[PDB]
Amino acid sequence: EAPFTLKVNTLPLNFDKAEHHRKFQIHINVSYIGERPNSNMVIVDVKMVSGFIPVKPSVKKLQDQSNIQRTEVNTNHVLIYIEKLTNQTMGFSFAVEQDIPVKNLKPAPVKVYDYYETDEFAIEEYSAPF
Amino acid sequence: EAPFTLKVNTLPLNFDKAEHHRKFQIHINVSYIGERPNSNMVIVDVKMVSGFIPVKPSVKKLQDQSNIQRTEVNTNHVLIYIEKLTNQTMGFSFAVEQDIPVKNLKPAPVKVYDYYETDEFAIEEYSAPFSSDS
Amino acid sequence: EAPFTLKVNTLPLNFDKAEHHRKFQIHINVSYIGERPNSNMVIVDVKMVSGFIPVKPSVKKLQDQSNIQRTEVNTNHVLIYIEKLTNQTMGFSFAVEQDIPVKNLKPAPVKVYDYYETDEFAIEEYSAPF
Amino acid sequence: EAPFTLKVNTLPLNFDKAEHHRKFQIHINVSYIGERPNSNMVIVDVKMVSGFIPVKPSVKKLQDQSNIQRTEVNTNHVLIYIEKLTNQTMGFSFAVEQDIPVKNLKPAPVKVYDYYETDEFAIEEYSAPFSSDS
Numbered sequence: 001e002a003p004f005t006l007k008v009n010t011l012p013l014n015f016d017k018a019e020h021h022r023k024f025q026i027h028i029n030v031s032y033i034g035e036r037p038n039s040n041m042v043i044v045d046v047k048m049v050s051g052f053i054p055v056k057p058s059v060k061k062l063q064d065q066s067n068i069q070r071t072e073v074n075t076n077h078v079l080i081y082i083e084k085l086t087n088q089t090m091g092f093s094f095a096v097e098q099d100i101p102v103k104n105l106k107p108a109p110v111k112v113y114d115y116y117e118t119d120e121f122a123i124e125e126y127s128a129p130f
Numbered sequence: 131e132a133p134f135t136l137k138v139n140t141l142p143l144n145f146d147k148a149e150h151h152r153k154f155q156i157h158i159n160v161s162y163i164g165e166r167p168n169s170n171m172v173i174v175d176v177k178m179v180s181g182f183i184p185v186k187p188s189v190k191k192l193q194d195q196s197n198i199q200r201t202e203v204n205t206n207h208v209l210i211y212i213e214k215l216t217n218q219t220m221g222f223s224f225a226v227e228q229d230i231p232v233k234n235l236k237p238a239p240v241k242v243y244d245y246y247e248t249d250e251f252a253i254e255e256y257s258a259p260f261s262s263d264s
Numbered sequence: 265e266a267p268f269t270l271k272v273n274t275l276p277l278n279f280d281k282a283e284h285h286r287k288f289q290i291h292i293n294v295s296y297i298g299e300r301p302n303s304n305m306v307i308v309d310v311k312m313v314s315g316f317i318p319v320k321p322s323v324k325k326l327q328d329q330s331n332i333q334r335t336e337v338n339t340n341h342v343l344i345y346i347e348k349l350t351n352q353t354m355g356f357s358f359a360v361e362q363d364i365p366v367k368n369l370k371p372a373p374v375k376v377y378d379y380y381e382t383d384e385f386a387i388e389e390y391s392a393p394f
Numbered sequence: 395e396a397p398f399t400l401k402v403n404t405l406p407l408n409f410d411k412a413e414h415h416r417k418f419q420i421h422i423n424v425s426y427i428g429e430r431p432n433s434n435m436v437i438v439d440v441k442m443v444s445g446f447i448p449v450k451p452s453v454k455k456l457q458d459q460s461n462i463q464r465t466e467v468n469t470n471h472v473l474i475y476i477e478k479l480t481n482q483t484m485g486f487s488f489a490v491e492q493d494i495p496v497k498n499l500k501p502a503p504v505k506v507y508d509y510y511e512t513d514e515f516a517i518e519e520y521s522a523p524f525s526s527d528s
Contacts, residue, residue, distance in 0.1 A: 015233075018230050018233075019230060019231070019320075020231065021231045022231070022232070022233070050263045098231070098232075100260075100261075101232045101235055101258070101260045102235075102260060102261060102262070102263050103235040103257070103260055103262055103263065104262055104263050104264045105263055106263050106264075130234065186328050229321075229324070279497075282494050282497075283494060283495070284495065285495045286495070286496070286497070314527045362495070362496075364524075364525075365496045365499055365522070365524045366499075366524060366525060366526070366527050367499040367521070367524055367526055367527065368526055368527050368528045369527055370527050370528075394498065
């Protein structure tokens with residue numbers, strides 16, 4: 001029903017090690033399936049699972065992709081500015097690491113929406129691989 | 131209906147403005163409520179939670195108490211040898227500190243049992259005093 | 265001449281094995297032979313031989329000793345805080361393991377000094393058992 | 395004054411941001427400068443350095459060259475059978491990877507010799523391309 005398709009998956013990283021903090025990759029898969037041939041600039045808003053913060057370098061290297069204008073790291077939110085989306089899938093990802101341990105972890109929301117047409121959006125949830 | 135009463139509580143010591151490594155206190159409250167007037171020597175087995183090890187000095191100073199014969203620090207386990215337990219509460223504690231980052235936040239078990247009557251025991255759980263999302 | 269006696273010796277560990285990294289024990293023998301009956305808090309600063317890093321658990325277990333208040337592991341330096349020293353020898357040790365192989369290894373310095381009287385110190389060198 | 399010229403160089407392939415196991419290239423540069431117009435079949439014997447084994451595919455692909463009859467991979471040794479050498483330089487290479495952690499950083503020998511005239515040879519050394527303290 002939504003004009004955007006959004007699939008969020010998580011994959012653990014360095015789980016068998018010791019001196020490292022819990023860390024995982026957040027994979028975002030998105031596309032535009034609305035009436036228009038393509039969307040305008042799109043924003044993917046990823047809220048952090050409690051106690052987890054984004055690994056800055058991995059977030060910033062997303063800007064290297066031509067379809068990703070820029071990235072912002074605010075308080076427990078990662079913003080990804082995407083140039084355009086068509087019905088072709090776009091799959092990108094970034095890592096997050098545990099800053100403060102928190103139990104009974106609840107899922108965090110991910111929102112994708114057209115910057116100029118906010119009524120066009122899709123919301124999905126994801127949870128830490130633990 | 132265990133022949134022993136066991137209550138385990140944790141008290142965060144510096145979880146807010148700690149310097150390098152945060153630590154907390156494990157309070158053990160136990161008594162014997164079985165059929166005998168008192169127990170024989172009792173062993174309290176405290177398993178450590180992920181990423182935590184006992185602060186040795188605090189464990190050893192438990193031996194200063196008349197009712198505590200000795201203490202043992204094994205791989206992720208603390209053993210406390212108690213001379214005797216009655217239906218009167220015995221409340222002791224020791225500290226544990228973080229050696230490596232947490233790999234989980236699961237609860238660790240605590241077992242209290244009569245050395246000569248192993249069939250008489252009680253098991254309870256506890257976990258690191260981290261803030262909850264709930 | 266120095267108010268502190270300092271002797272540093274190294275002993276190889278797990279040298280006949282295979283899947284393990286080169287590893288060795290650093291033995292520190294120290295005492296105070298100055299004018300005072302004893303020193304104040306003393307600091308032993310052990311610099312790492314290139315490519316070698318300290319085996320954390322062995323460094324931390326030094327704190328179990330009553331005469332060792334605490335230990336610090338900084339960048340290629342291990343600091344040991346000793347409560348007091350008299351003319352009686354104090355011999356402790358910890359292990360270090362090869363993180364990155366480096367050839368033509370030069371000796372690394374070890375410094376012992378009174379925290380409040382820095383003019384009172386002794387410096388010695390040690391090298392990897394290879 | 396060897397009847398063969400032998401130069402061995404190593405090129406680190408991923409010693410900086412490697413994933414699990416780092417590997418490097420061994421470049422062999424050789425020629426025949428003896429009294430004859432050319433040599434007979436020549437054998438280059440490359441001994442491996444501590445903790446390193448040859449990356450088989452790279453060794454085998456050497457056989458694709460017309461001047462290389464075949465290659466052999468023995469216990470910590472790589473043999474390259476060269477059809478012929480003149481005073482013209484022949485420069486080939488192959489990769490080696492780390493199987494077990496280093497037990498030393500000593501240099502390994504490389505020998506080039508005429509199969510039928512073993513008295514005619516040249517020996518040179520090389521070691522893993524690790525950073526130096528000097």
